[PDB]
Structure formats: C-alpha cells, structure tokens
Amino acid sequence: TDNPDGIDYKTYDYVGVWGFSPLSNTNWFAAGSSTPGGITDWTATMNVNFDRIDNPSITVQHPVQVQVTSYNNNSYRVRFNPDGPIRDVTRGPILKQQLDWIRTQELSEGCDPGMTFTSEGFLTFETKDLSVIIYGNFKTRVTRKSDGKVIMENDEVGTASSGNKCRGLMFVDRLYGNAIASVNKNFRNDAVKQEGFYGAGEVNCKYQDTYILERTGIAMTNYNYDNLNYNQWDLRPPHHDGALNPDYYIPMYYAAPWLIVNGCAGTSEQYSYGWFMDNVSQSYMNTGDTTWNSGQEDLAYMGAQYGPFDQHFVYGAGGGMECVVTAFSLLQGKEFENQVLNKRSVMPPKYVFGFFQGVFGTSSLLRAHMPAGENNISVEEIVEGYQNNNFPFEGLAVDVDMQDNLRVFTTKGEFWTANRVGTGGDPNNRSVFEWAHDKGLVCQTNITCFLRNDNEGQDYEVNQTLRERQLYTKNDSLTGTDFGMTDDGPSDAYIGHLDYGGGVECDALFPDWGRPDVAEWWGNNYKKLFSIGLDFVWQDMTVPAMMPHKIGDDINVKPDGNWPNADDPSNGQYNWKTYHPQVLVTDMRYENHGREPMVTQRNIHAYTLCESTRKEGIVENADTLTKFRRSYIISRGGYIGNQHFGGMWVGDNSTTSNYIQMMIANNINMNMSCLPLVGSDIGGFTSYDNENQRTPCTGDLMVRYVQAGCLLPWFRNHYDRWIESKDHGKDYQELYMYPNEMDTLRKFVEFRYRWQEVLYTAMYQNAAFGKPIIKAASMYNNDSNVRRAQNDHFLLGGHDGYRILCAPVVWENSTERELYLPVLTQWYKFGPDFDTKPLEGAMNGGDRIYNYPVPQSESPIFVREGAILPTRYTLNGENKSLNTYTDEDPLVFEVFPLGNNRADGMCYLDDGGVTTNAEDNGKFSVVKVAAEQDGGTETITFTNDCYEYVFGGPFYVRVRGAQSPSNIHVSSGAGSQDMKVSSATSRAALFNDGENGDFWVDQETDSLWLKLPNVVLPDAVITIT
C-alpha cells in the first residue's frame, strides 16, 4: 500500500531557493476561474479551475476549501490537494479537533462569519474585525472594518488574452513536478506602508557586517539540516567562490514556514498578520528577493517541493505583532484536551531555567577513574570548578561520552562512582546522574534516534529489539536506489552512519516513526535512563543528522568535501546529510496511510521524534523518573508546534561576535514562531581560531556572550572539547576557567537567578496565553523608532511582559553601544550591580543615545516604571541550584518606581516540577499584585487567580524610593495587623531572624522591606501611610 495517491516523484535532491521559481510562470498552474461548491459549517468549497499560466487552454479542476478558523482571532485558512482527495493530517501543529473546539466555543458565543456566496459566485465572509471577499479567479482582498484598509491581497499575473490568473494558488503541472506555491502583493517599498516581514525560525541574515532581525526582501527555505556553523559548505549557492558566511538562503535546524507581516509600523493605522504554510516537505518563503530572479521586489510568496496545499492567515484579536503570535498558538492549542495548564505549550520544570554546563569530551564521572589522555576532563572537575567558585550552577549536559561505545540509552563504567554499570539505586555505585543529584544538580543527557549496528558481536538490546519487531526504516525505494549494506544487516534495513569527527563514528539503524508500536517502543527505552537518575532530555542529531554519503560509496565513506556542486550536481546520489531522499518511510503526517519517500515530509522527522519522547517517554514513564516527576526536552530540530514537547537550542554555533548577534535574533524570531524556550550555546559550540583550533573563547567575548543570554530562556554553556581521544575542539570554556572575568561572569548568573520567577512566570504566560517570552522591539506599539533598534533590542518580563528591556553589547572589545529607550514610558538602569545599591534617576523613554557607555562589567538592561518583579534570594546568602531551592529562600515582590502612580506584577507558583500535579490537577497559583499612590497613602494589593499551591515561607514587598513610614497596615483574610519596625538592620538578618510583620528601612538600597507571613500571599491590602 505504498504511495496510495499515484504520485510520480520528479524531485528528490535539495533545491536551493535559486532553483525555486514560481514567479517563473512556466509549467505552473494558477486559479483562472471558479463556480461555488457549497458550505457546511465554516468550510466553504470553491470548485476552482487551474490554468497553465503559459498556455491557458490547458485546464484542470480541483476543489479549494476556504475555512474560517477563528472569528474572534481573525484567522482563516485555504487548502486544496491537487494530487488527490483533501486530507486532514493526524499528526502536526494544527489538528482537526482543536479547530473544531475553537469553532464550537465561538458558536456558543454566537459568532457569525456569515460565510456566504454573492449572486456572482464570489465568496464573502467576516471575522471579528476583518471582512474578506474572494472572486472568481480566487483574487483575494482582506479589508479591515474600522478604517476600510486593505491589509492583505494576493497577486495576479495577466496573460495574452485569457483573463487574469491568481498566483494566490499555484501547483506545477504534475507532468513536470509536484511543487506548490502562493503569492501576495508585498508593500515593502510602499512609501507609507513600508511592509516588513518577520519570523522564519532560525534563519540568519547578514547586512554589511551585522546580523539582523528582519526577514524582508530575501529568499529563504525550510529544509532541516545538520548545519554546523549555520554555513555548511554543501549548502552554498551554485558556483560560490570563497568562504560561505551564514545567511538567509541557508536553511537551519528548525522548520518554520511562517511569516509575520508588519506594515504602517508604529502608528494609528498599523496592521499585522501571520502566514503559515503548513507543509513539511522542503518549503520556501520569499519576501521579494530578486537574487537569482527567484522573486520580484513587490511580491512575496511561500511554496513547497510537494503537497498538499494548506495555508493559514492569522491576523489576531487586536493590536500588535505579539497578538499574531498568541492567536497562532491558539490554533495549535490543547484547549480541546481540557489542558488545565498546558494550553499553548508544556511547562518545563523550574530547573530548566538555571545554568548548565555541557561538555563534548568528558571521559569519566570522577577523577579517580579518568583514563589518561591529553586534556581529558571529568565531570567531577567541572562541578568542582563551578561549585567551589560559588557559581549559581544547575548541573550538566552529559554527552555521548557517557554512552557505551556510542550506544544510545546506556552508560559505560567510567561514568559511575565505582567504575562499573549498575542497575542503579546502589549507594556504593552511583551513576553520573545520581552523584549529580547528591551535589544538588540535575542533568539532561544526549539522545539521538541512532541505534548502533556495527556491534562487533557484542550484545546491544536496543538495536536487537528493533530488528525483532521490524521497527526500523527499510531500504525500499520507488527508484531501485541502493543505499548501501554492511555485514551486520539486516538485509532490508536502511543503514546510515554517524560521524562526530576525529574517527568517532558508527553504522546505525533508525525508527520508522510512521509505524504504530514504534512510539511505544521508543518511549519505553528512556526507562533505562530514568531509573538511573536522568532528569531531562537532550534530543540531538534529529534530522536525522547522518554523515554525508554518495550512493555507491561504502557506508563509512563520505564524498569529497566539495561534492556535490553546480558543476557536478547530486543527481539523486547525495544523502544531504540524512536518509537518502528516496527512502520509503511510513507516513508521519497521515496515519495508516502507506509509505512515501522522505523527501515529502523531511521537515517532520524531528517533530515526530520529539512527540514520541514526550508522550511515550517522559509522560507515560513519569513513574520511573526519580527526583522530579515533570521533565522537559531540549531539542536541536523540529517543526512548528514542537513547543508542546519542550524547547530548543540552536545547534552548532561558534565563538565570534556574529554568533552572539545571531543567537539573539534567533531567540527573538523563535519566540514569535511559538518556540519561546530556546537559546543558543553560550560561548559558542565549535572552535574558531584558524591558526590553532584549540584556542578557547576570549574572556571579553565570554562576558558579552553570557550578558546577552543570561536572560534568554535556555541558558547553557556547551562546547566541543579537544581531548586526545577526539582531535577537534577547544581546550576549555567553563565559566570558572576565566580568572580575570570570574566576578563579572558569576554576578550575571546570580542576577538571572534572582529573576528566575520572572522567567518561570513568563513561561506560564506562554502556556496559558501563548505570549512570547522574548519580545521583538517591533512588538512595543506606537513607537516609530523600535524597528531600527530591533536587531539587538528586545523585551521581556513583568505582568504584561514588556517590563524589562535588554540591549546587550554585541561586539568583542567594545565599551559602548547605540541605545534606544522605547517611548511613552520611563526606564531604569538595572543589572547585577543594582540589587545592593539605589537606583539611578529615571531615563525618559523615547531617547536615542549614541555611544551609551557600557564597561565590560555591565550590560544594558532596564526595568520600566510600573514593574513589580518576583525575585528570589537564598536564605544563607550563598549560590545554590534552583532545583534545591525551597520555600524558605525568600520570595520578593520588588516594587519599582511608579508609572502614572500605578505598578503591577504577576507570579506563577508551583512545586517546581517535583511532581506533575500542576499540569495534571491544576495545583498551581497565580498571584497578582498592584500598587497605587494616592496623596499620602500607597496601597499594595495582593489578590490571586487561584491559590492551589501554598507557598510555604514568608515573602516580602520591596518598595523602591519610599523610605521610613508613619504606619503600615496589613489587611488579610486572617489579618488586621499593624506592622512594627523590625529590629534587624541587615537584609540578611531580616530574612533569617526577622519577625513576620517586620518592616526594615534599607538606607543602603533606598528601599523599604516588608516581611509578611506565607498565608497573606493570596489576598491582602497593605496600606503605607
């Protein structure tokens, strides 16, 4: 039952953006005419005639569905299959039942889009603030009720005499290909509109010498790659000479055919809409890039190498780009599952927000058992470096080093306290993870879906059980292609190779995910790791990232590095560093459907791998997790929607100023693509010095790299380590190996740690409401100067999520930067210095300052007026892992200067992930807090949205700029108590000795500290007179 729809597959190789050419018109079909086709529900059908743009006498008929997806969040949808029936996928970001729920709810509220056909046969409908008309040839116009503004319209190519053809719908004559595509007008050169496109996951784009955030006038592609340095040689343009820098026509780790359009920016008449082409074969986004005549300046499109054609336009409930993001997240929501917490994504354990050292080149757990080898390091030495130097440190990212000769899901003797593999729980032979637990730390470890094959007779249960149940991808192809074979077999299995450099490699098999019983099988395997202490997951080589290889060559032999190329094209022989594209894999998009070649769903493999570690690994086997029941995944690849499995790190960056910039833009863009909890390796993964690869990150680059990411969602220093056993990489990169910079380094980690609940809460605001943790400058509304500052200015935190503004310096050996404060509000210089000192005067928003000074010891980070921030200090004053925090380590609602005599704050509370009762049973709290000045009385009010988690220790209000009071009244469900002056004279003595109901006047920081009991948290009126 392979290929049920009779597809003839014309394309298998990687087609660069330069080989994708729908504005070509030749051999392309576009809508020319239609007759109406009925409406049930909110799906209308138009029976559309597609004409060959280059010979319109040739026509075919296919039906197109036009579905309103959310009246309230102004989103609809267009799809059609030109290769067969129209078909609801069963795995993906947008599922039927989440659409069906949204619609049902909205119907109960009595929303009517009034999907109707005029007499002429045109389709008209309405969403909340938008109206839409679609003409005969599919010419689509999207107007905005309030000001009549056309905010979006598709494009039309005229012909010699056959009328006009809407390129809003295009597929290639199935005689010549399978590509699809869709075209809009693009007002990026409109004097008043100045359209600007955004999003597109991990794409990178250079301008002059600087990496930027905007994705306008450029030709991108989604094509998940093993793209080490974001600039892999094989991904270069035809006939490209010299080095290849990362750039926009190079695909990355994550598949996001998604674009957020923002025109008439920062003014009354502004509009934003998102654009998801839901497809998982190689996709394209072209924002009007003339390079290679691939696009035209005044048009934009999306497209794919294969079908079917499914596409979403999401305008959002209201003003600003952010709302596009949140509505998009709704469409992928889990409201239909009655998720009480995880609606828009799954919440990680608190601990996932702390600092992690990853090392590629440890070679034992402890020093006592470390084999002799030049520059070898043990885990024990790392933990020692950090712990001894009072670094706030969370734990390790153990690599394949630990595995037994690269056998995913196992460990070798060296990574245990007693030099042998235990079944664990033996206190005289703890595994890495268990020892790690006793040090306070937690770990992820690396898991690929690569199952060793060259085992040398040696027994490896995970590969053996894959062969038995035939759960491996088979070597069949509709082309008779020979992918190679070894002596280990089996005879009918796809056998790829895994190369990590310097002879660290092996043959491998792989999970044919499509198959049923495969996700169960995958999942139960993580038990071999959970029962030994593994906290969370490090999902890698997810592409699958296999070794380059030419059909015909041996399995362990890759091609010449310069192959393939324009003069010597692949011609169906290159594997593009993964399965040779022809391999028949079982469908991952439609279940019980048959087998397709991988070329048709390449961009789904990692999503699907991630889905399975989630549902079948972490969730089903939570019983076997040890110290924490909740868990997470940090993944390298995936596709839109992946946020419901965990988050992302941007694979293999490097150690240069450019990569810092890139990491930030990437972060910001990944947020607006519904992946909030991502980040890039701090300090860079790969070597960088061309004379001597072993040279490690400079101190100053290390400071800027940490300063820039110390408030990004995922914070992890990871790197390729040179050791005798692996002759590529750098000497060291751990924070503690920098004596000169240690103090700056560490204080910026402590600082993140004090703002831990800020991250936690923002994350909650993402699960609950879908808000991006990190916020493009252009998300701040009514500001005509945020856009120019958008490459390196970003915001996060607070009740609304726009309370902290970061503008990290992005160049090595640099002590200034151009700073823009966003307008119509006040800002305050903050940082690790400002905890133990008074704030400086206000900074008037709307300012541009050239050469704003930033000594190495400082990053530009500001807190807005009106912010109240949940902060967290240790009781004993030391630095300790988040996961060892308990409710005795104070929680501090820091009120800042007031904004129009107002201030507000939100704080999510829950057990941390010790258990899954927050996501499972609604066991959490959401504390709100307000503050108002009224002549002489300031009223700080605590209310709750629910208080299901009982924060067990006293918490504090910290007022900034208000000193010694005449009285403080505290009102509570169990309060009617006046406050008395504490007898402690230091913050430390207030926390540890301080009496409940004690206020302390802090001269040093110009603050007033209120110590209150744990029971008044959910509800109180603090009046300060």
Ligand SMILES: C[C@H]1O[C@H](O[C@H]2[C@H](O)[C@@H](O)[C@@H](O[C@H]3[C@H](O)[C@@H](O)[C@H](O)O[C@@H]3CO)O[C@@H]2CO)[C@H](O)[C@@H](O)[C@@H]1N[C@H]1C=C(CO)[C@@H](O)[C@H](O)[C@H]1O
């Ligand atoms: C560890 C790493 O292994 C593989 O990376 C390869 C590159 O694919 C290959 O191009 C070559 O890279 C050199 C490149 O050719 C040259 O132009 C450049 O200047 O120098 C590069 C090396 O610095 O060799 C490297 C190996 O050294 C994989 O393709 C990568 O995915 C892989 N990174 C993975 C693997 C691990 C180990 O489990 C993780 O530590 C890491 O997080 C993950 O991203």
